């Protein structure tokens, strides 16, 4: 039993809700919140901009030190950093950004990172400003993630569209 509330159950392990991931994380304080990161951990917009703003830029400060030490992530890769005031940990995961020409096949690799954590609050990878089809992102999530994932979908039209189209 966990403290996530109001989620629709899609499969044994995947749950979905129309919610603002920032507000959800502040309420639940999950062990892991997933950020829709880029390889440079430059948290400008979308989910990343929102999560970073909610940390008063502490996420960006920590991320800049991480990059200065380790260099960029790989597309499809991840790193674990602090969750600041939002969660115990933040799993920064890089899905392919279609608006940069990156290979959508890497979306499965990106979701594989979730399997290293028993429970996660997460967005749909490569959705929104990363330019992939969200119906496809949800399908890849369900077919790749085996741990317990609570998906927060920003827009109601799409939340409603994803449920009604879910197979
Ligand atoms: O991953 C992309 C996803 N983005 C977010 N998901 C949940 N909460 C969020 N808060 C701020 C951004 C954000 C998204 C899906 C459909 C339409 C637009 C954006
Ligand atoms: Cl977005």
Swiss-Prot record:
UniProt topology in membrane: Multi-pass membrane protein
Catalysed reactions, semicolon-separated: Thiol-dependent hydrolysis of ester, thioester, amide, peptide and isopeptide bonds formed by the C-terminal Gly of ubiquitin (a 76-residue protein attached to proteins as an intracellular targeting signal)
Boundaries of every Macro domain copy: 1-167
Compartments (UniProt record): Host endoplasmic reticulum membrane
Highest taxon of the lineage: Viruses
Function: Responsible for the cleavages located at the N-terminus of the replicase polyprotein. Participates together with nsp4 in the assembly of virally-induced cytoplasmic double-membrane vesicles necessary for viral replication. Antagonizes innate immune induction of type I interferon by blocking the phosphorylation, dimerization and subsequent nuclear translocation of host IRF3. Also prevents host NF-kappa-B signaling. In addition, PL-PRO possesses a deubiquitinating/deISGylating activity and processes both 'Lys-48'- and 'Lys-63'-linked polyubiquitin chains from cellular substrates.
Name of this protein: Papain-like protease nsp3
Lineage: Viruses, Riboviria, Orthornavirae, Pisuviricota, Pisoniviricetes
């Amino acid at each position: 039993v966990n403290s996530f509330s109001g989620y629709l159950k899609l499969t044994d392990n995947v749950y979905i809700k129309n919610a603002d991931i920032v507000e959800e994380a502040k309420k639940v304080k999950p062990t892991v919140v997933v950020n829709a990161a880029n390889v440079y951990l430059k948290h400008g917009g979308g989910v990343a901009g929102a999560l970073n703003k909610a940390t008063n830029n502490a996420m960006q400060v920590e991320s800049d030190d991480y990059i200065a030490t380790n260099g960029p992530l790989k597309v499809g890769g991840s790193c674990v950093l602090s969750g600041h005031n939002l969660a115990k940990h933040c799993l920064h995961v890089v899905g392919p950004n279609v608006n940069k020409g990156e290979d959508i096949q890497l979306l499965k690799s990106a979701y594989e990172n979730f399997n290293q954590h028993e429970v996660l609050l997460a967005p749909l990878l490569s959705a929104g400003i990363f330019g992939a089809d969200p119906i496809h992102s949800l399908r890849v999530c369900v077919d790749t993630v085996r741990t317990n994932v609570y998906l927060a979908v920003f827009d109601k039209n799409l939340y409603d569209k994803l449920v009604s189209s879910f197979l």
